[PDB]
Subunit: 95 residues, 3 copies
């Protein structure tokens, strides 16, 4: 039972590569992405689990500052506990 | 860090327009929708962030009463904090 | 307002049937599944609401032990309250 912060980013489809690049540079182990609708126009949704709150805010602050003046989008955070995940918890395990 | 209520509605694909219409009339700023499976048959999932609990229940109570006697579906709620989002937090920001 | 445990499983696409079969045998009422990306390669995401914590861990422990030595994936849990859902709450309702 390793606690975690689930960061969610919903925004326009064009930024996929731009946001994916930012997530990799933050220190996050991995992420999930999926095609969605919004209002209905096609857009994307990122889901990133992070060990610390600070890392989650670091990802949100950069994406918002860089693109949210021009492009539409929303970013929010949820509490979670990771039970299994080699990259997130390590070979040691989530215990 | 503006607190929010994440309302989730999973139900049959036919109701997309019917449920989308209800969400707009509730006072919710926007929503996300996506194609999913369930048991596997194709169905839809709505995700709505709301400022108050009452608004979330207002959306759930109407959709359930109107369609859940006939159609299959589930509605649940999650705690969240919106970090960035112009429509949800306003030009003032989520602070 | 019936409390629930939202179990989420993200893993490789091949295991869809293998994991779907396990979820059915656990005692979970139903589930949601959807095509997603991850890092970008195509993969799947399961979402299972469960009445007890023990049932959620039972599903996670079996899937992890059986496939997570070979295949990549992450499993985490979120708090939630089910407002409407005939299969989850019964004909009595979520109250």
């Amino acid at each position: 039972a390793k606690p975690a912060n689930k960061l969610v980013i919903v925004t326009e489809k064009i930024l996929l590569k731009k946001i994916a690049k930012i997530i990799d540079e933050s220190g996050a182990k991995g992420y999930t992405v999926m095609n969605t609708g919004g209002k209905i126009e096609a857009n994307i949704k990122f889901e990133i689990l992070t060990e610390t709150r600070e890392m989650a805010e670091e990802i949100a602050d950069r994406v918002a500052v860089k693109y949210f003046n021009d492009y539409a989008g929303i970013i929010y955070i949820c509490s979670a506990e990771v039970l299994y995940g080699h990259t997130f918890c390590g070979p040691e395990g989530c215990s």
